[PDB]
Amino acid sequence: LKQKNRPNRLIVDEAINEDNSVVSLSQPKMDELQLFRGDTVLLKGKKRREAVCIVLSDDTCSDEKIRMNRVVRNNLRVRLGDVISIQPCPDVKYGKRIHVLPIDDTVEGITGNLFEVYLKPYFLEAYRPIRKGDIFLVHGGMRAVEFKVVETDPSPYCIVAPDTVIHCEGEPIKREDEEESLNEVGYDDIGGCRKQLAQIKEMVELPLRHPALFKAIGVKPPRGILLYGPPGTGKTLIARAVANETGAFFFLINGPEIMSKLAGESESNLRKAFEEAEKNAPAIIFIDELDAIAPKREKTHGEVERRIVSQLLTLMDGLKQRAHVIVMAATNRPNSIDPALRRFGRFDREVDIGIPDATGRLEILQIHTKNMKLADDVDLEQVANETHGHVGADLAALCSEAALQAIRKKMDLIDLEDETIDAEVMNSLAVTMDDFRWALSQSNPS
Amino acid sequence: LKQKNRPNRLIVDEAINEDNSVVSLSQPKMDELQLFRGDTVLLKGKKRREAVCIVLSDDTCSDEKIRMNRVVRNNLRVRLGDVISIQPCPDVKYGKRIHVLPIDDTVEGITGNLFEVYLKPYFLEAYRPIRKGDIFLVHGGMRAVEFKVVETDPSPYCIVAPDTVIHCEGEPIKREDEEESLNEVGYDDIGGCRKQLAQIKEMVELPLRHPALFKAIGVKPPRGILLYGPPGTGKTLIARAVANETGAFFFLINGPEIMSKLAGESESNLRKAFEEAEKNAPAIIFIDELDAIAPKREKTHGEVERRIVSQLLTLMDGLKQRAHVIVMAATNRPNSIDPALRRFGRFDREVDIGIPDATGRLEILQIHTKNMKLADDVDLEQVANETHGHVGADLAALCSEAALQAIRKKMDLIDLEDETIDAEVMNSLAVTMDDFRWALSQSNPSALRETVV
Ligand SMILES: Nc1ncnc2c1ncn2[C@@H]1O[C@H](COP(=O)(O)OP(=O)(O)OP(O)(O)=S)[C@@H](O)[C@H]1O
Ligand SMILES: Nc1ncnc2c1ncn2[C@@H]1O[C@H](COP(=O)(O)OP(=O)(O)OP(O)(O)=S)[C@@H](O)[C@H]1O
Ligand SMILES: [Mg+2]
Ligand SMILES: [Mg+2]
């Protein structure tokens, strides 16, 4: 499973100064796709992000490309060169009411009514399509304020008509909250695991999306997938990526979290997890650190511990064939899991999330430095070559250490007590190859 | 115990275009059986399925055969060539009301009042016999809708007379739910176990059905039957089969399920199991994964664990001789079970559910591919010969892997994101002998043939 050419899959191209509500295609592409000037369209990017836009023809736009500005790209979680899909969006109703909120660092020193100075002029007679979760910037007077759509009615998208009530009351959204959302883990945040992610799409996502495929040929897909491998290889990261990328309902079950609960509560929470999944099928259940809740029914002296293992076995068996629920799990101690959980019809497929090679190490180093300020002498391939035996977590730690060393080198220009770090220290901060070589000397993968 | 020739046992034969309410016999058969034109009859198929029909003579019908259409065959869970039984059904009364529901995939884009367009014209002045659980198809305008009979009054069958109230209101039945039902496990879904299924019928079904036989000769039949053998040999499958085939009440007790319950709740559920069985006798109790609830009273450090074992012992002893309850159990670790449970009067009979041979393996492979699209080059006897050391579960896994490989080969025509798989990919999908060879050559099937020489 790689990415196939389809007529509605298009490469993201720039449109500086373009309005937030507009995307451009070439006329032949529009003709191919049966899209007419002014049509509302639905765009799909990464990590299940969507955007509703107006489509306009552009004779400077290549057939295979879509022009869109930076606001739309950010909402779609995509960069220039990425691929998106476009489809008609005919069903879109005029809005009854919408609720948007300002981002806290764009309104410090509250001056000017937000509705009157920003939103009213932005939406005035424009009939903008909007979607819940959109972030958009607006200029008002000599200032710019960033807003988030928190709710729309109808949900999750509508047209902002003259009659749509615009609510902007409440506590401003924190930049840190939205920045945490903005860099939620996707498949792109996973290095050195191309083969495994493909195993995962074929065993988990494909049967949940297209069960007709499996019915057609007359095969029941396996329902239990164990990720295993040593610590820090990316098992939990992959879970986060699946959670954020899948089209199914996702229910995370954390091993130590169940085990931390009162006797009786552990079992109950497991049952509720499976029930929620079932009710919301198609669904994925992910049981992280499976060994914590399901060790061999001999290496648990506790009656409650054996009981919880029994409870999971019952829940795995209890999942009807037509439930459309795939259970994923992860462990760094697979030989410690009760063998009963590994029988036909339970966890009977396995995916080795192991030690990356040099090429995978480089992938991982590029991912973990993407938001890091690097000097021009940083050679990551050279770092990749010198980190044999390192897994993903050792590489992220190495990157952090090089950064921390870069900061340590300015401790002669920082005083802990100042309320403000000197701007020119802030502006010039870069991680150098030397900082990396120094971390390479401190890095111990154990 | 094999199948005996009886005058009312007949071979299922085709009747294309026949009405859903009609079966045909030869006139001599009808004479033999004392059946007259238009009589209502009760048909019995597999997995306790029944059908009520009208019987008509047919001079093209062999004496030993019964003609019936595809609707009736599906209701009886039988195919062409299977045997069914027929008997008069004189007791049948006009229904006060019946309730049916459409199948969801037959009503998408809800066009038409279902009663007026389909049911009314289907039942109009026809006086159709119908049974709870029947599925039947009806054409109305340019469409066809499949319905299930969910309830009848009287129950479970009646005649749909002019004055019978037909209800079709409610949420449509899911096709997936009925496909699951249709493919519920029977004795035909168990391969390579002929000898053991006979042991089971002789030790379980026979004393429950004909206790007089055992009384007459003066013998108390054993009341505890332990199925044992290695993992994936079909112990649970057999339990499913028995549950769906037996004429008795069936109460399943799952080991890990009892063990997952609160201290005190485990013991209570065991008691309730035995009580329900007793109240509903003749009954079978099946305790799957017995080792989970009854390991040796030394290899359990838990007071509650020892208490549960004691509870089962008490419940086994507590079953009066006239209770008409047979307890089956299954385990893949029989030497781990408390020896007290294997004394005279408890689990004192045993059935070895073991490794199949090549002929058994082939049976298993035909069962597991019956609903699978096979290419013409698939040679299952050859697959049987190349799976030494394989049990049932390994054969089902082998089949699934071949099919999964077949799908993997089309991953250049499938994009995960499409709403719809391309039709001609759907239509042409078949598992080939190469797909099977690929599955056979895999680490796991290959490591497994060494295991049993
Ligand atoms: N394949 C990878 N690609 C990119 N970053 C990775 C990878 N593996 C690990 N990392 C980094 O290391 C961090 C910790 O890894 P986790 O996914 O929590 O390890 P894990 O495999 O779940 O470990 P265990 O078994 O719970 S100790 C991640 O959150 C990433 O920042
Ligand atoms: N004799 C058989 N005939 C046909 N199919 C079988 C047979 N045995 C196993 N299978 C297949 O393998 C699957 C698992 O078999 P089960 O009956 O659950 O195994 P089991 O013997 O109960 O295993 P344990 O002891 O609980 S691990 C079944 O659902 C069938 O698909
Ligand atoms: Mg982890
Ligand atoms: Mg079993």
Residue that is last in its domain, among A313, A331, A354 = A354
**One domain, residues B305 and B197:** yes
Handedness of CA A183, A187, A193, A194 (dihedral sign): negative
Residue A429 tokens read as 């901060």
The CATH number of the domain holding residue A159 is 3.10.330.10
The CATH number of the domain holding residue B53 is 2.40.40.20
**One domain, residues A329 and A253:** yes
Q: Exposure pattern of A72-86 as b/e (b: 16+ CB <10 Å)?
A: bbbbbbbeeeebbeb
DSSP classification of residue B206: H
Q: How far, in Å, are A222, B138, B153, B162 from residue B121 at the CA level?
A: 45, 9, 21, 12
**One domain, residues B324 and B382:** no
Question: Do residues B77 and B45 touch, judged by C-beta distance below 8 A?
Answer: yes
* Domain span including residue B162: 92-184
Angstrom distance (rounded) from CA B321 to CA B214:
13
Q: Resolution for this model in angstroms, one decimal place?
A: 2.2
**One domain, residues B189 and B332:** yes
DSSP line for B216-255: HHT-PPP-EEEEE-STTSSHHHHHHHHHHH-SSEEEEEEH
Question: Do residues A13 and A67 touch, judged by C-beta distance below 8 A?
Answer: yes
Ligand 2 shell residues, CB under 6 Å:
A 343-344; B 190-193, 231-237, 332, 364, 367, 392-393, 396
Residue A439 tokens read as 């971390």
| B314 annotated as belonging to a binding site for a ligand | no
Q: How many CB atoms lie within 10 A of CB A115?
A: 15
DSSP classification of residue A174: P
Query: Cα A152 from chain centroid?
Result: 23
Distance of CA B289 from the midpoint of ligand 4 (Å): 7
Residues in Cβ contact with B112 at an 8 Å cutoff, skipping those fewer than 6 apart = B118, B140, B141, B143
**DSSP reduced 3-state for B189:** helix
**One domain, residues B178 and B237:** no
| Tokens 């008609």 found at | A88
**DSSP reduced 3-state for B442:** coil
Q: How many CB atoms lie within 10 A of CB B361?
A: 28
**One domain, residues B214 and B312:** yes
**One domain, residues B350 and B390:** no
Counting ligands in written order, the one closest to the CA of A366 is 1
**One domain, residues A189 and A322:** yes
**One domain, residues A315 and A205:** yes
| Tokens 């082998």 found at | B398
Nearest CA owner, ligand 2 atom 24 = B231
> Which of A205, A220, A301 minimises the CB distance to B301?
A301
Question: Which of chain A's residues have a Cβ under 8 Å away from the Cβ of B177?
Answer: 322
Question: Which of chain B's residues have a Cβ under 8 Å away from the Cβ of A195?
Answer: none
What distance separates the 2 farthest-apart alpha carbons in chain A? 73
Angstrom distance (rounded) from CA B224 to CA B286:
10
The CATH number of the domain holding residue A377 is 1.10.8.60
Kindly report the backbone phi and psi dihedral angles of residue A26, in degrees, each rounded to the nearest multiple of 5, phi listed first. Answer: -75, 160
Handedness of CA B1, B6, B12, B18 (dihedral sign): negative
DSSP line for A330-398: EES-GGGB-GGGGSTTSS-EEEE-----HHHHHHHHHHHTTTS-B-TT--HHHHHHT-TT--HHHHHHH
Chain B, nearest residue to A2 by Cα = B415
Residues in Cβ contact with B209 at an 8 Å cutoff, skipping those fewer than 6 apart = B247, B282
- E-only strand ranges, B274-324: 283-288
Show the 3-state SS of chain B: CCCCCCCCEEEEECCCCCCCCEEEECHHHHHHHCCCCCCEEEEECCCCCEEEEEEEECCCCCCCEEECCHHHHHHCCCCCCCEEEEEECCCCCECCEEEEEEEHHHCCCCCCCHHHHHHHHHHCCCCEEEECCCEEEEEECCEEEEEEEEEEECCCEEEECCCCEEECCCCCECHHHHHHHHCCCCHHHCCCCHHHHHHHHHHHHHHHHCHHHHHHHCCCCCCEEEEECCCCCCHHHHHHHHHHHCCCEEEEEEHHHHHCCCCCHHHHHHHHHHHHHHHCCCEEEEEECHHHHCECCCCCCCHHHHHHHHHHHHHHHHCCCCCCEEEEEEECCHHHECHHHHCCCCCCEEEECCCCCHHHHHHHHHHHCCCCCECCCCCHHHHHHCCCCCCHHHHHHHHHHHHHHHHHCCCCCCCCCCCCCCHHHHHHCCECHHHHHHHHCCHHHHHHHHHHC
Residue A310 tokens read as 């029994």
Ligand 2, atom nearest to B239 Cα: 17
Ligand 1 within 6 A of CB of A396: yes
Residues counted in chain A: 446
Q: CB within 5 A of ion ligand 4: which residues?
A: B 235-236
When scoring A217, A225, A341 by the number of chain B Cβ atoms within 10 A, the one with the most, hence best to mutate, is A217
Experimental method: X-ray
Q: Exposure pattern of B246-259 as b/e (b: 16+ CB <10 Å)?
A: bebbbbbbbbbbbb
Number of domains in chain B: 4
Angstrom distance (rounded) from CA B41 to CA A370:
77
Beta partners for residue A149, in sequence order = A100
**One domain, residues B207 and B339:** yes
Question: Do residues A360 and A192 touch, judged by C-beta distance below 8 A?
Answer: yes
Q: Which amino acid is at B401?
A: E
Residue among A334, A443, A340 at smallest CA distance from A393? A443
When scoring A299, A310, A316, A346 by the number of chain B Cβ atoms within 10 A, the one with the most, hence best to mutate, is A310
Angstrom distance (rounded) from CA A66 to CA A68:
6
Angstrom distance (rounded) from CA A352 to CA A366:
22
3-state helix, strand, coil in chain A (%, to 5): 35, 20, 40
Angstrom distance (rounded) from CA B27 to CA B29:
5
**One domain, residues B393 and B438:** yes
**Spatial strand order in the sheet of B97-102:** B135-140, B143-153, B97-102, B165-167
Beta partners for residue B88, in sequence order = B41
Residue among A143, A89, A82 at smallest CA distance from A114? A143
Residue that is last in its domain, among B145, B162, B184 = B184
Beta partners for residue A251, in sequence order = A285
Angstrom distance (rounded) from CA B14 to CA B16:
6
**One domain, residues A344 and A206:** yes
Q: How many CB atoms lie within 10 A of CB A235?
A: 26
Residue that is last in its domain, among B31, B63, B91 = B91
Angstrom distance (rounded) from CA A219 to CA B373:
9
The CATH number of the domain holding residue B265 is 3.40.50.300
Q: Which amino acid is at B278?
A: E
Residue B12 tokens read as 């299922």
Q: How far, in Å, are A37, B5, B50, B92, B205 from residue B210 at the CA level?
A: 81, 19, 22, 27, 8
